Structure 1
């Protein structure tokens, strides 16, 4: 019992983090096999960030301008290339601590653990979601670029995120491990505003099912609704519209609890129209949207890695 924002154990990723330095700029890299992956803005000065021509800047750089250190031990750089927004540094040694892994591009609403790093070293781990506006609500300071987000299934680390930047509103943007940004952001110090941050409705439902499983049941009501009717309400409160794919994904939680999805939706609707009246759900006074249905079942069934 209990319900916490829980991250994956970070040990498999800790072994992969290194420090990459180019000229006077330092950030974090991810060493997998004989490749180090890092943000291409490793090659810029802070002045360069106003309007960088990365191709032009990279011509001035050789293999020996890229220092890569793993713990206190220096890697030899034998090749470099740019893919989208990331640099791929070929080194002469395979990482012996390399886990089984995959690169995945996640969808908005999906969750992942972040291992925040500075200077190639782990400082902390936390969970977050890809928001519908393709930002994450991270915790990251100067030097945290190259930190990565990941999921773990049994033996296999799926890398989904690499951190690149903070917006002036204090939320975070980054890439997949092929270098392509999530959302419209670019790796330049320019005006970039994030769009509407909608609430991940299927996640909120999953969390209400979690609450029921844990004994918090005060918000169950006598009502049901329809997908069309609930969606009129979600639109008004800036919730993402619920589809039948979502309903399908909630079917295990619905079965475990005996609460039909549409009845849970009617519960949600009343909480939106009426608020929480100063009450809490699973220790929160807000509706939580950063647990996926898979997260809830995993946490409430004790899956290990």
Structure 2
């Protein structure tokens, strides 16, 4: 029985109309054109032959407005340049007439967001990811994809949360918030960097087990219960995040009549082994679907 659960992205049209190409010297990547501002990663200033441990403060000073070329696939004349953390803020002379209603925000581990992968200012695909507990995402990014953006949507308002910067040695990806900070302890330097350990997102595992119940698959449900506090102590020893419930999890508990604390116990047992049984066609726990995804795609509740 198919769960009805898929990796679902926001429609990308509104963001598509905001993507531009930014070139500086030997380097080309993507930017995001909102109002009179173009945001892009600051390593566009960096000579393609010196991306290792660059001095961005000095590269910045060396640039003038004419050092930047912004192109929509039109030329947008740059009339101002600034650096905020790991991002540039270029002011251009034309405001984007397709600028949507938007905010900036910072996404938290466990939460999902949509990504528009672009090359040369040209959108090429969209996908959705969860921010891992070690502040990477498991994306699909190649050379020339920096500046691609990740975003959520609430109603008509687009909440930009991510601008892609780099790949780590283990094939996962990270980038910046639009306040210029990198997610995690990462730096936009092409050198060896420690990576924090990943973890299962307990809340998303709970969501997944609820999805299974909503699909009639409930063999893992016993009357036994672990409290939230005792789960969280267990979790620290076991590479799960600590669980923090939400209203969306409460809704699932109500629709199913199965308590969070019964699924926490179930997780503790399934972690040691499924024992031949499957769950929604899987033999390991799934933490890539959020309580919100389950509520929306299975129950029609946004």
Shorter-normalised TM range: over 0.9
Matches within 5 A, 1:68-79: 68-71=70-73, 73-79=74-80
**Deviation (angstroms), 1:232:** 4.4
Greater shift after overlay, 280-289 or 45-54? 280-289
**What's 2:182 paired with?**
181
Unpaired runs of at least 5, structure 2: none
**What's 2:106 paired with?**
105
Structure 1 residues 77-96: Cα deviation after superposition (integer angstroms, max 9, x where no partner): 11111111100111111111
Shift in CA distance, 21/112, structure 1 to aligned 2, threshold 3 Å:
same
Matches within 5 A, 1:134-213: 134-213=135-214
**Deviation (angstroms), 1:276:** 2.2
**What's 1:34 paired with?**
36
Shift in CA distance, 29/278, structure 1 to aligned 2, threshold 3 Å:
farther
**What's 1:297 paired with?**
295
Q: 1:46 aligns with which of 45, 48, 55?
A: 48
**What's 1:258 paired with?**
257
Q: 2:10 aligns with which of 8, 11, 27?
A: 8
- TM-score, length-scaled by structure 1: 0.93
Structure 1 residues 115-139: Cα deviation after superposition (integer angstroms, max 9, x where no partner): 1111111111111111111111111
Give SS of 1:133's match: coil
Instruction: Give the number of equivalent residue pairs.
Output: 300
- TM-score, length-scaled by structure 2: 0.94
Q: CA RMSD in A?
A: 1.7
Inter-partner Cα distance in structure 2 for 1:17 and 1:152: 17
CA contact (8 A) 1:117 1:144 kept: yes
Unpaired runs of at least 5, structure 1: none
Give SS of 1:58's match: helix
Structure 1 residues 188-237: Cα deviation after superposition (integer angstroms, max 9, x where no partner): 11211211101110111011111211222232234222234333443343
Shift in CA distance, 16/284, structure 1 to aligned 2, threshold 3 Å:
farther
Greater shift after overlay, 28-37 or 229-238? 229-238
Inter-partner Cα distance in structure 2 for 1:225 and 1:187: 42
